[PDB]
Design a protein around this ligand. Structure first.
Ligand SMILES: *Cc1cc2c(cc1C)nc1c(=O)[nH]c(=O)nc-1n2C[C@H](O)[C@H](O)[C@H](O)COP(=O)(O)OP(=O)(O)OC[C@H]1O[C@@H](n2cnc3c(N)ncnc32)[C@H](O)[C@@H]1O
Ligand SMILES: O=C(Nc1cccc(OC(F)(F)F)c1)Nc1cnns1
Length: 447
């Protein structure tokens, strides 16, 4: 039922990503109609003499060619009938089956219009595929409480590196299920994901408060994630003044809780140590808050500042070493935001392929800088800054782990996973993709 394409615009899009650096071209782009089409293509790759590379492309948000299939075939997973949300008395909640290539923005609109339901755990940007984020983790301000998106999925349909369609969960083929979650596309292509849902809030009380003291800022973020009155979202960012820290929190509400929202916010804020008179508040619908990054994208696109190189660096930093990151990186080493917020490791299932630091509390530190348009030297200076951040972590023994890892050397991947996790990862590759057909742009395995 699928269609192979050699259209120059199809090839060009499959040969690029948001990073704007890696440009490995496929021989063709495959447009599937259903899961069986994806199975057919991977099956032919597995059966072929040379064993050509096959990679699924979500929305192309990768930084360094992770979705590229050099001289092979890129599967354009972008979008037919959609499954309606379902209630389960056994799970004690709702779920929705979605196509692997579905964008989170389209999942949200579908679930809201069919029962006022929504996923519990997000990414900051909704124009990302379900298969794409589930192959990494999928993190935002809710992860401290609900865990990442890989902790909010009941079941998958996976097309393995042998072109076999497998239904998997915790109780059915758990090795493939847990391997695929945070598995960097190594063990198969997600064609279906069964997403956990909750009754969606109607509105959001979105708060920002400033700190000049890093010790007070991190102490407040750490207390907020341990919280039963609590915020529904906890993030933060580094701002140039010398250096300031912005705490970002939200309180979700609906018609029932509308009458208590003001007091709940005031109570929680009173316990914090932000700078007096630096509180900024917005009240807006739930969809609008979740789509806030798409609004920033439209403004950047109009200024020609979206289709520029993005040498993004994402680190998971153990909370015991975050203090050293202030004078060492934010005041030391250093257009674009620097995100910072802690998460709880216990909300992350240790059976998944996801790699986190060996500490109960760890931070995402996200360097989201854009290079100047049409200026290669800008990208080069930013790449040197990223290497200086990595050298700082190595030289001071910070047990940081990259999120969306950009490694390409075997010993670097071995160090990233550690011996036990590397052994599990390699064994899953021998079982599920022995010819190393899938997601070869990640640069982990060779045929
Ligand atoms: C560009 C961007 C990315 C981003 C973000 C904001 C922007 C503007 N905000 C994020 C956030 O708040 N939290 C988070 O966890 N991630 C955030 N990101 C990063 C994003 O998650 C990643 O870029 C991720 O790769 C998803 O993006 P996308 O859906 O575009 O997928 P991809 O880049 O094409 O492919 C990524 C890898 O996964 C493999 N792949 C793709 N689809 C599948 C399926 N269906 N099954 C299995 N593997 C799949 C690709 O081959 C590639 O290896
Ligand atoms: O990217 C974000 N958040 C995020 C937040 C604001 C804006 C933004 O995109 C930009 F800068 F282009 F407007 C991304 N979080 C990530 C986590 N992991 N990789 S990226």
């Amino acid at each position: 039922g699928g269609r192979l394409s050699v259209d120059a615009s199809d090839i060009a899009e499959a040969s690029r990503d948001f990073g704007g650096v890696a440009r490995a071209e496929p021989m063709a782009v495959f447009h599937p109609r259903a899961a069986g089409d994806v199975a057919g293509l991977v099956g032919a790759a597995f059966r072929s003499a040379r064993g050509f590379r096959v990679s699924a492309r979500g929305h192309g948000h990768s930084i360094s060619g992770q979705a590229q299939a050099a001289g092979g075939v890129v599967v354009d997973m972008s979008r037919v009938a959609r499954a309606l949300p379902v209630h389960s008395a056994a799970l004690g909640g709702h779920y929705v089956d979605v196509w692997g290539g579905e964008l989170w923005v389209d999942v949200l609109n579908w679930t809201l219009s069919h029962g006022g339901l929504a996923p519990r755990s997000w990414t900051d940007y909704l124009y990302l595929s379900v298969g794409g984020t589930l192959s990494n983790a999928g993190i935002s301000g809710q992860a401290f409480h609900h865990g990442p998106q890989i902790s909010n999925v009941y079941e998958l349909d996976v097309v393995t590196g042998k072109g076999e369609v497998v239904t998997c969960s915790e109780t059915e083929n758990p090795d493939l299920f847990f391997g695929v979650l945070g598995g960097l596309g190594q063990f198969g292509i997600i064609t279906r994901a069964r997403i956990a849902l909750e009754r969606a809030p109607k509105r959001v009380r979105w708060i920002r408060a400033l700190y000049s003291n890093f010790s007070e800022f991190t102490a407040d973020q750490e207390r907020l994630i341990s919280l039963g009155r609590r915020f529904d979202y906890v993030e933060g960012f580094v701002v140039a003044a010398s250096v300031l820290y912005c705490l970002e929190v939200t309180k979700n509400y609906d018609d029932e809780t509308a009458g208590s929202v003001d007091q709940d916010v005031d109570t929680l804020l009173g316990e914090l140590n932000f700078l007096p008179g630096t509180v900024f508040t917005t009240d807006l619908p739930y969809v609008d808050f979740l789509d806030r990054v798409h609004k920033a994208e439209l403004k950047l696109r109009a200024k020609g500042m979206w289709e520029v190189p993005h040498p993004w660096l994402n680190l998971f930093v153990p909370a015991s070493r975050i203090a050293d990151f202030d004078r060492g990186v934010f005041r030391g080493v250093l257009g674009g935001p620097v995100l910072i917020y802690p998460m709880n490791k216990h909300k992350w299932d240790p059976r998944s392929s996801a790699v986190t630091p060996d500490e109960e509390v760890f931070y995402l530190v996200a360097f989201l800088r854009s290079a100047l348009p049409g200026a290669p030297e800008s990208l080069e200076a930013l790449a040197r800054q990223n290497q200086r951040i990595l050298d700082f972590c190595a030289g001071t023994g910070i047990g940081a782990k990259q999120y969306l890892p950009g490694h390409k050397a075997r010993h670097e991947w071995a160090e990233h996973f550690g011996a036990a996790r590397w052994d599990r990862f390699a064994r899953l590759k021998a079982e599920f993709d022995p010819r190393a057909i899938l997601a070869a742009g990640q640069g982990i395995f060779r045929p």
